[PDB]
Amino acid sequence: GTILIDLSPDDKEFQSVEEEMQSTVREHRDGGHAGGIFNRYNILKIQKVCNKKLWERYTHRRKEVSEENHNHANERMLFHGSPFVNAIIHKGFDERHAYIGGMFGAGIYFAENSSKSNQYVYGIGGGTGCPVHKDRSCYICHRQLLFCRVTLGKSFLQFSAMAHSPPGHHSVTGRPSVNGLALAEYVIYRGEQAYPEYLITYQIMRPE
């Protein structure tokens, strides 16, 4: 039941999603090992993901969380990178999209930094890079990220350098405690707490 609607580059909605993508690029401590070496992207396409059933699943859960947290869903727009983006947009987030080995336990991980999500497009640690050239820094191959609506509710704050959320909480917030330039990362433990709103197709750009 999923349809994808192309946004025009002239549309303010395209432009605001592109700006969030581009402006949340940062340098990574691996020197580009996982995600490649780049300062910006070539955005090729932004599509709106429309699925009524998946949307209703999201809003149902959002209301449950809101009602447990003084009518505050604590909703964010966050990036998600995965080899399984095409499964996610069709069937929704579920336990198969969780990172069993992540720093904050087995949940589904989201990032404020688009470049953090870019590290996971080809798998954990960038896997073996693009399927065509086996290059984690491929400048040719088309990559895809999701820009998602995420319900955090009451989030457990972890300071730092599928399971259940901590008792009394709906998510975990991974606050950076060393790298002063990194933005937060977030983990949810219920697939119904995220909706994949935008599918972004892009390339990383080789620095000049």
Ligand SMILES: CC(C)(C)c1ccc([C@@H]2NC(=O)c3cccnc3N2)cc1
């Ligand atoms: C390949 C699997 C399912 C194991 C996977 C997929 C995505 C991610 C995940 N993607 C993110 O965008 C992300 C954002 C912030 C921190 N960690 C992330 N990993 C982890 C693991």
Ligand SMILES: [Zn+2]
């Ligand atoms: Zn490639």
